[PDB]
Amino acid sequence: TLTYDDIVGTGLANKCPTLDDTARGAYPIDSSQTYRIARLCLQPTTFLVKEEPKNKRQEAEFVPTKLVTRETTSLDQIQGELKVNSDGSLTFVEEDGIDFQPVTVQMAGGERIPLLFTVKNLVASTQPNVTSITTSTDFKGEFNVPSYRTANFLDPKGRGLASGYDSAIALPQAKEEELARANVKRFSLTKGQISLNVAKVDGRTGEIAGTFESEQLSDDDMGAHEPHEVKIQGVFYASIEPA
């Protein structure tokens, strides 16, 4: 174990715990004993942004991006119950934790793509009949993607949703129909997909690890413009305990 000072500034704090190459066993499920996740953690590795195919529909792919912010990406302290289902499957239901981190990445052109990387209200599920959690025991489910900026946020001209100006006060006698979209703030709420596929188990202490892949929309700037589609790959670590 390492104290705070042994981590400060090293970047280690933005790193989900890891299991050794050994720990590749299996954790048993009593199915008559409630389980929960004491600590789920998500560490991003890559941020992919699906590019707009221009007007010419030609099918679009995801493109790598540079992390214009720094080591503030990881999700940690996630918690909730891992209820066993009648079909013998497992479903995780998140309660609370650092379930979101605002990320901003740049592209080829130089465009900054801000997103709210999150897993809020996560409902991941596994395969039916899973007496023991083996290596690669896929977790799949949805989560909620709230607006990047919240209600109180004001644009450089003072306009906002829950507060701020009603219109473009700098242009007292201008036509407003054109400025409509920029004056009227909208609060976006969308769904997201994620899949946690195990790679390392440890029946002894009951801590699994592996890799994840999630998809969601980026910031729409209070509904000022269209959001980009984002794909996020990284690694995860979960602490399963009876409780």
Partner: protein, 335 residues
């Protein structure tokens, strides 16, 4: 070769160079060149910077929609605070430009060189056999740069609160400063304007007086300036006629007759005044602000009778309440 290093030192120290590269110059010249080059490029083509660390990038470069008056080089991020953020501290240049990297590179290089610039103003004076203290006069504008770019950020806990490198950005620095510190109601600032106003006053005083008491050596249709040759023995103006005039303007004993006592006063006044204004910013960097006469005079019942000090407070609230919109989450501004 009499000895390479010995020659090198003789070349550096040489008073026969068009521009005196001193020993301070060996540090000045490179640091200033890095500062200037980085600035020019930044001011023109640098991308928007997240100054307040709230993921709200501010564009201040020409190519990104600015003009000379609005354009600026934006201070480093508030997420960085007082941390050292060189290029080799970033995963990429994209990241470095987003977090206001250039700003630190400029201010550190400028302040270092500008200090050496002061050091050189001593050195050349030494090599030429003239008295020093010219550099001491330059210590006042330098101390202001130090206070605005370094001292205030150290005090406030972040370089993001340092004065931006641009016209309008400077205006922002002032307005906000006034809100958080009430600088207009601070003695050190008042001494500053006194030095600056007086400075301009005296600059015009002396200027006019001297140029008005010039000895005639020029034609009616010939520039009065030609009545002076570079490298004269005697004076080109009648200082006794000047004193005679100004002495009657106010009253004799309130007038200078000693050129040396005159020029000392001419140098002392603005330098001392600016010294205090530099100390003002350095003092209000630790939140020892100007006088607070809010709700001082109250009537016999307890009603608050307003003064001009209260009207100033209303303007100050307006600045405070509106500055850094989305940066605050809590009631008191302790940062």
């Amino acid at each position: 070769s009499a000895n390479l290093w010995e020659r090198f030192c003789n070349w550096v120290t040489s008073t026969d160079n068009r521009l005196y590269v001193g020993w301070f110059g060996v540090i000045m010249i490179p640091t200033l060149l890095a500062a200037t080059i980085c600035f020019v490029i930044a001011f023109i083509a640098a991308p928007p910077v997240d100054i307040d660390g709230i993921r709200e990038p501010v564009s201040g470069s020409l190519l990104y929609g600015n003009n000379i008056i609005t354009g600026a080089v934006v201070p480093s991020s508030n997420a960085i605070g007082l941390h050292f953020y060189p290029i080799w501290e970033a995963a990429s240049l994209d990241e470095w430009l987003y977090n206001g990297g250039p700003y630190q590179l400029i201010i550190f290089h400028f302040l270092l060189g500008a200090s050496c610039y002061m050091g050189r103003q001593w050195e050349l004076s030494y090599r030429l056999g003239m008295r020093p203290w010219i550099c001491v006069a330059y210590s006042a504008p330098l101390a202001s740069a130090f206070a605005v770019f370094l001292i205030y950020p150290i005090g406030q806990g972040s370089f993001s609160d340092g004065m931006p490198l641009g016209i309008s950005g400077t205006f922002n620095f002032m307005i906000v400063f006034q809100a958080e510190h009430n600088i207009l109601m601070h003695p050190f600032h008042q001494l500053g304007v006194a030095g600056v106003f007086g400075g301009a006053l005296f600059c015009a005083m002396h200027g006019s007086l001297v140029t008005s008491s010039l000895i005639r050596e020029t034609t009616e249709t010939e520039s009065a300036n030609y009545g002076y040759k570079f490298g004269q023995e005697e004076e080109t103006y009648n200082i006794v006629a000047a004193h005679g005039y100004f002495g009657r303007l106010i009253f004799q004993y309130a007038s200078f007759n000693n050129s040396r006592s005159l020029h000392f006063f001419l140098a002392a006044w603005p330098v001392v005044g600016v010294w205090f204004t530099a100390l003002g910013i350095s003092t209000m960097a630790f939140n020892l602000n100007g006088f607070n006469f809010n709700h001082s005079v109250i009537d016999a019942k307890g009603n608050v009778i307003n003064t001009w000090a209260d009207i100033i407070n209303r303007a100050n609230l307006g600045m405070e309440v509106m500055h850094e919109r989305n940066a605050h989450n809590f009631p008191l501004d302790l940062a």
